[PDB]
Each structure stands twice: as structure tokens, then as C-alpha cells.
Amino acid sequence: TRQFLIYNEDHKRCVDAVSPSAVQTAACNQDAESQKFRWVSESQIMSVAFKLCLGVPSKTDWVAITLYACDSKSEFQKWECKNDTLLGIKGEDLFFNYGNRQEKNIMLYKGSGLWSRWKIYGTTDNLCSRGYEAMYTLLGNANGATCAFPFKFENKWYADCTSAGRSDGWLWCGTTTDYDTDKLFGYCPLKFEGSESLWNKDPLTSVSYQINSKSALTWHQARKSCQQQNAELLSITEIHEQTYLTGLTSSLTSGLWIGLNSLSFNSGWQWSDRSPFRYLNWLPGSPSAEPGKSCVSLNPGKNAKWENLECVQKLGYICKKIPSESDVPTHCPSQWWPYAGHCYKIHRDEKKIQRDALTTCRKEGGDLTSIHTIEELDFIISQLGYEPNDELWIGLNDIKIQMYFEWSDGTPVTFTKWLRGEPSHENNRQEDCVVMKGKDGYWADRGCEWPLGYICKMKS
Ligand SMILES: [Ca+2]
């Protein structure tokens, strides 16, 4: 996925590493290891066959591009994409070029024509689209540090993770260049026989969880580690899910990053996997009113309740794994208005407490509105008659099960859009009902015993 051939459209040829001193071109061959390259840092491109990096002797016109021992400090090994498909040495208008003066070697060249433009073979994208993706190690002795490609083991160089030196087939990488000297490694986030033993599958739900308690990563690094495993940071949307994760972490004490955060300045608490924030299990004193603490850790030594911390804290973490043809005219009863097969109405006449608003909607054949998409929310605010300074009941509430918000109409909660700072759900304030308020129609919990207007919904 992260190895690529380097393709020139005009010549219809791919780069081919012939030797450390001969980087040329050949008819493209997706199986040829000598045609395979990979980003091993932000700016370095490594030959997979040779475990050496493309570089130049100087940043000057018409010098050969060949292969050097990879060196992250060398300016002569740094490449960048200019315009779109122009490939050049960093910091100069000098380009990776093939075709001039009967020269079979790639040359660094002042020219910026089509012979200096390159794409990832099999795509329409430039090389920097499949840029460097740091690979965070699992278990091991390096606390989740990233693979250092290429790395040396038994005096041999590795361009990718390997099972060399092992009897169990597990794939690992050095987290420094010289593993022989430094002995720092971890296992790679890749598929291999036995790799699923890094996950715990809930038999009730078939959802899988990975508890990385030995790693020390920031919230954003931890998120990248889960993402590159086709996963995301833990989200917790059911009581059972919390109970299951409490048990899986019951012998741990240090904090574990989960996916909950307040990193969107204009909205409230949210899961990084876009799950609804509808279940709350905060530690006492959280979420705290401290502006820099926008990322949430599960504290396994305190019954796996949650606390918000500074995102740069290095912790373990937990992964979890034109109208449409159907938009036909919609029948609605008088005073109700259609959207996506349902009918809606705002009650402003007589403000009511939440439970009386609910009774009224139901006597009229509907219910307090549920809201399942941003488009449904946008219909309400932009067309239905909502004004920015409104505050109106919707159907979300945790009256039946404290800390577990549900829709009064019984439909699943699959979407939340909370105001900044919401849900606040402050101790002893009984904020068990929910309103839409403010110019964006975002939501807030609040006490249920206050007269307000409200929004009803029904099926057409
Ligand atoms: Ca509130």
C-alpha cells in the first residue's frame, strides 16, 4: 500500500534502481523489487531493493540522481512535489528528470517539462499523495516508537517489517536504524498469522478492542496508530461497552487515550470515529473547565471513568474496530411540513415543559423530533422557522437511564451535535432533557421543568 513505482507519463516508463550508482528507467513492472520505492521520512525516498535513499552530490544542474546511505540530516536526499507532478530537490527549482542527451540515468535538471513530472504508477496522483506515513509499533520495548526504515539486523538491511530472528512469524521493525546496536523494536501494525491475538473480540457484539498499555503516545499519534490498523480510538456508546472495557482494563492503572475530545472549537464533546456522544461516564470533576485539556483518557485505576487532559500527554491508548429518485413529494397533514419522508412542526404558541411538549406532539400524531443527520438538522434551522436565538425542546433525554441519552420516539441515537461546552450534565442540576439553541441549531442538555417552544416530527 505504501510502496510505489515512480512513473513518467510521457515516456511510459518507471524508475528502476540498477545499482547504488545506477538509477535508470525500464518498462514498468509492478513485481520488480528494483522498481519499488517508499517514503521513509517526510522528504526521503528509499529504494526497496537496495535499502538506500535517492540523492544527489550537490543541488546543481545536470548531476546524477543515485542511491546513498539514508541520512535524515542530508539536504541532498530531500525531495518535494512542486506544482502538481513536478518532482524536485527540496529548496531548489531543480528536478528529477529522464530523457535528455541520451542519458540513461535519472538526472537532476533545471528543466520543468513533462520529463520532470512523475506519478504513482497505477494512479493519477503525484508522489507526495502517498507521502510518508509513520508506522507506530505495538508492544515491544520502544513504547510505541515508529519504525525506522531501513534498519539493520544481523548486519542485513530491512526495508519493511520482518519476521527474521523469530520463531513465531510476528512482524517487527527496529525503531532506530541500528537494531544490532540499540536493540529497540516493536511489532508492526500489519496482518500476519497470529496478529489478531492483539485484539479482544467482544463475543456479544463482535466488536474488537486493542489495549496498548505499554505505549506512550500523544492523543493524535494514538489516533494515527488506530487509523492505520483500519480502526479508531475507542468510542463508548453503550453501557455494556463500558462494562466490557472496564473488565479488559481492570488490572491497569495508568491512563489510556480514548476517542472522546472537544477539539472542534464550535461544538461540544465528540468521538473521533463520529459516534454519537450519548453515554457519559466522567470522573468526578471532569469534564473540567480548563481550556487546554481537550482530549480524554480512560482511567483504568478509577473504574475506567473518563477525564480530559492535555492532548500532548504521552499515554497508552485503546483502539476499536438534484433530488434522489426516492425524494418524491411528501404528504403531510395541515400545519406540518415535509422533509425526507417525515413531517415537522414548531410549536411557539404556548411554551411547555418538556413532558407536556412531548404529550402535545404525541396527541397530534407525532413526537418530539429526533435528528439523525446534519441535513435534517439543517432543514430545521434553515427552512422550518427556527431563529438563531430560539431555544426549543427536541426528543433527546436521559430520563429512563441516567447518563444514557435516548430519543423519546425510540429510534436509535446515531448522531449528536452538541453546543460548545455541552452536554454539561452538571452534578445535581438534573440536566436530563435537551434543546436546540443558537444560530447553528446545536444541542444542550438542561433541566426539564422549564416552559419552552418545541419541535415535533412524524412519519408522512
Ligand atoms: Ca447544559
Side-chain angles (χ1 to χ4, degrees), residues 138 210-212 215 217 222 225-226 233 256-257 315-319:
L138 309 172
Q210 184 185 78
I211 300 171
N212 299 296
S215 298
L217 301 186
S225 170
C226 302
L233 284 166
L256 303 165
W257 285 131
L315 300 173
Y317 57 106
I318 305 171
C319 301

Side-chain angles (χ1 to χ4, degrees), residues 422 424 431 445:
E422 293 284 330
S424 61
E431 306 190 81
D445 64 359

Side-chain angles (χ1 to χ4, degrees), residues 16-50:
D16 190 23
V18 175
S19 81
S21 67
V23 177
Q24 307 179 167
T25 64
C28 296
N29 184 349
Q30 277 184 302
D31 294 334
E33 182 180 70
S34 60
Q35 298 192 10
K36 295 184 184 178
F37 295 85
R38 176 215 286 260
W39 298 92
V40 298
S41 72
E42 181 188 356
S43 301
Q44 290 168 279
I45 303 171
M46 182 192 64
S47 163
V48 171
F50 287 92

